[PDB]
Amino acid sequence: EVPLPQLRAYTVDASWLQPMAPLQIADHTWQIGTEDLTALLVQTPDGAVLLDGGMPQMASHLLDNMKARGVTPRDLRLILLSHAHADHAGPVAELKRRTGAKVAANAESAVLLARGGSDDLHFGDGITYPPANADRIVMDGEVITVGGIVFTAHFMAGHTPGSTAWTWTDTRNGKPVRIAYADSLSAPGYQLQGNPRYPHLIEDYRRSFATVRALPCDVLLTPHPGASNWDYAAGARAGAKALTCKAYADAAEQKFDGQLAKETAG
Amino acid sequence: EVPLPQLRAYTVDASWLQPMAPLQIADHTWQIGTEDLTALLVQTPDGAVLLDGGMPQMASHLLDNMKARGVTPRDLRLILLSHAHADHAGPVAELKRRTGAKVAANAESAVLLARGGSDDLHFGDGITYPPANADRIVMDGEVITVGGIVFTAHFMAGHTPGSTAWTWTDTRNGKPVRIAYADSLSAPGYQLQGNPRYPHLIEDYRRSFATVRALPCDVLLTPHPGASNWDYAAGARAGAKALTCKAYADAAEQKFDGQLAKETAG
Amino acid sequence: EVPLPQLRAYTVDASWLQPMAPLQIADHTWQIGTEDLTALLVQTPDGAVLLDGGMPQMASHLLDNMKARGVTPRDLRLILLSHAHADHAGPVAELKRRTGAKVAANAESAVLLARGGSDDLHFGDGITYPPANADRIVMDGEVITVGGIVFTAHFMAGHTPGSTAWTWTDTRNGKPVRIAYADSLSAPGYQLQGNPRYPHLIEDYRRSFATVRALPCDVLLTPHPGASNWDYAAGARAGAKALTCKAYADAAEQKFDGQLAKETAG
Amino acid sequence: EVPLPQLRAYTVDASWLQPMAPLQIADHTWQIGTEDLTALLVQTPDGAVLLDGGMPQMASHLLDNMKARGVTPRDLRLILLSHAHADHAGPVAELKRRTGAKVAANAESAVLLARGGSDDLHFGDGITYPPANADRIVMDGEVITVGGIVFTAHFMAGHTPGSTAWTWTDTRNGKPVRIAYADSLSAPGYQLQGNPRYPHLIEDYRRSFATVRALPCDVLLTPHPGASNWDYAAGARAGAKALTCKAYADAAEQKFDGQLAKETAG
């Protein structure tokens, strides 16, 4: 006789879980996650902002890296998200319990975060994480200002309904650097055409390619660094090969068109 | 010396609170709210659907009208909403406690409903109601089927971010009737241009006019019946003067353009 | 170099996941879960009640067993819980999406259920499941009546803060049978003395032993059947060896006292 | 013909809404609410704690008084509550949006706060306010430490299920002062005996009288100052006539016993 299957944990490549020391991107912006998952710390005189946290088990490592940067738990004021999947929003609930931080997100990301990624449009309950509540709901194009750094939300629905690009301006070598943290544009295993849970999926992805192609973007970063050709382990050359926003959008669109053709053939 | 002001209740014109008996719209669709607020009951062999409930104090009247139609509390299966303001979603929390009904709404309407209309983008906490939780989140173009009546969601953001038109096909005199319950297109007292809480408000309203103009629409109904020229007190002629979806969208757009010009002058 | 550990799934003994056909307990009460996890279906003329659902992966099996009993998804009206851990409330969110059922629970169980068992007082995030919202909050001693079966809540805090015993009267061989579904009284790996997250843990367990010892109890059932000496695989003798409520409470108290002494020695 | 009644706002005596300047209670504890509603600010080197905020319309006045005390919005770290009725938790949602503050409350208070006081066991939807989410759930006897001030929760269910007394030690004239902020012990208009929504109401009130009588209590404060014989308008003599915890508990119990006798006669 045959029991029901055991629950399967969301397991990932080791590099996604490999801790790294903080890597400086610009004068106030640092990568503080793992070798293969982005978690950006932006340090202002009026507190710190974290954009993404990676996987659920990364909370203590993130807090250690914040401490190394001079950011104590009370100094973390705001958490922003690219999208509310387990590999990017995983440790948010724990970070809220252990720091002063509040979460700002759009309505779609907020509802997915509040269910811990369960009832995902494409994954069901296969990839979940501890639920968290948003403290502020943002609209498309809304700005949030922390210590004079202005973060602008650009909705780019597709990978999730609530997928968002965040943009801000930092400095480097005395000159402004317009940073674009653009969300994933992948559709891994998704049913694209005629999806009853996401009827306008294709139209949304197409608009999102155009949104990403037009972002203010001297430096592009992505939740999975390989998607924008970053190599966080490469030290002084980590960002040397990074794509432009235009090249990232074009590559994602070509991949998407090929996936559509393969789905029609399947 | 001067105390802080007393809380001010959301008071409305008497006709919005004037009970009426059920008024038949089509073979299975009835208006069961008040003279001046729409609440639509759609009766299927597999249970009943309510679209909107009006003001918070309308719950018992709605239940009385459902009983008169042969719908007991256990028979009410689904509540859908045009938008989550107090004059349309007011009694939802109470209806959920007193019936078998579950709520389906988009993410924007769900988050506003869960805060009881508080922290409204335009009204602040001036117009609130008992909070309720959604049981199902719908995406644009998603269908919900109850007893073979197919309800399709058409997002039409503007009046609220989560504003939705719902369409379904009923019958009358042996022939199909495509019913369009289109949301409000008003912007009462709103700051339209450069609104920090709703940066793309104007673009959203413009897209929503186009969405409404294109809906499948033999009969249009609106949350405030006067907006579509219904007169629920007029008996056999209640719907005689009703606007088409095209005329409703055109009228709303002309009014909106005049409001934009007045805001620029103000 | 050393990555962070992979997430660990909540894995359990195979017998906890071994499907069984419905086993009748009384005229309207059936065990419909697995060999080693209780999930009770109570069938009334006015719909069905489910008490517990076991592990998250049991949802489809529960629905199959309900169908075999003549209970369709629309007929399931109410879900009650012993306590909101993953091995008892696991499939609640999915059952709510797939049936007409609403959840009634005390405030403590409701808050734990809404966080999917995360931030557990003793387990942290080690044992989680998809979050769900309660539709009705019950107080100690409150009754819920479905089709003339009266369910009474008896709070018995300890194993979780919101641990509850549910009692009702069914019939068998023409005579009343007072059924007591008493929650777990175990404290597996818990810090009992001086626990900062549960300062009055010991006092609560002691009161709960007394509560269980006094329940109306012709037949005792427990979330883990072995705790009350049920053997769901034993057919016509499944309940033959079952403990009385008094014996269950006494055994749990003796075990608890031994655990206290071992903790003092450790 | 007769419309349904208009919604009725929760209106209160003017003195409950009369702003006052901060009144010092001890070296770090100040009354910063109105003449007749308590809102306590405790100032530590590691941020400020607010216990209660009064009515919904008091948010801006509270923030003004915090500023006068040298507490900016980012400095407010924690909000604690006596109980989650509109006249004590009214401005919590707004304070969370406008400050860094997080809320800690027991499960019962958290669920009532999250529904904005709707579906009250005794008032229904008659007395509601903007909903807010708790960030931390506390258990009976749990401590929360801010800047070396230790706040201890003492549950005292009755007035609401989640009613809580908070105790801490401050200093005055070089000597320790054990402050007890004890919740309301009133039952205004409540059905006490055989209440289906609160079956053990009487037993809970009786235990709560005993809890209050035993609190560490050099100085008692209450959410309605008159209940403990404070007169916040009396300047240097505001606390001169204050009751002891023992006298407050005894007075509440005598009043409760008289109410029970009147209910039996009614």
Ligand SMILES: CC1(C)S[C@H]([C@H](NC=O)C(=O)N2CCCCCC2)N[C@H]1C(=O)O
């Ligand atoms: C394409 C990715 C880099 S892989 C990861 C994905 N999770 C969610 O989408 C993920 O692990 N899956 C599990 C295994 C593969 C198929 C299902 C998906 N995140 C994607 C992203 O952000 O673009």
Ligand SMILES: CC1(C)S[C@H]([C@H](NC=O)C(=O)N2CCCCCC2)N[C@H]1C(=O)O
């Ligand atoms: C234009 C309406 C028919 S009046 C009502 C409105 N409430 C929310 O929007 C409402 O009572 N207000 C209060 C008084 C007027 C100004 C603020 C708005 N609903 C609108 C709708 O659905 O189009």
Ligand SMILES: CC1(C)S[C@H]([C@H](NC=O)C(=O)N2CCCCCC2)N[C@H]1C(=O)O
């Ligand atoms: C004692 C049980 C029968 S074992 C199970 C427990 N989970 C939660 O408490 C559970 O699997 N653990 C994982 C492994 C053992 C130690 C941590 C606990 N439930 C208990 C119950 O309801 O009495």
Ligand SMILES: CC1(C)S[C@H]([C@H](NC=O)C(=O)N2CCCCCC2)N[C@H]1C(=O)O
């Ligand atoms: C007895 C109070 C001082 S009067 C106020 C009460 N609200 C909630 O309980 C309140 O205004 N009511 C409205 C009018 C009277 C009857 C219903 C109650 N709060 C009580 C408290 O905290 O002891």
Ligand SMILES: [Zn+2]
């Ligand atoms: Zn993803």
Ligand SMILES: [Zn+2]
């Ligand atoms: Zn990813």
Ligand SMILES: [Zn+2]
């Ligand atoms: Zn409106």
Ligand SMILES: [Zn+2]
């Ligand atoms: Zn309206």
Ligand SMILES: [Zn+2]
């Ligand atoms: Zn358990």
Ligand SMILES: [Zn+2]
């Ligand atoms: Zn268990």
Ligand SMILES: [Zn+2]
């Ligand atoms: Zn009160």
Ligand SMILES: [Zn+2]
């Ligand atoms: Zn009060």
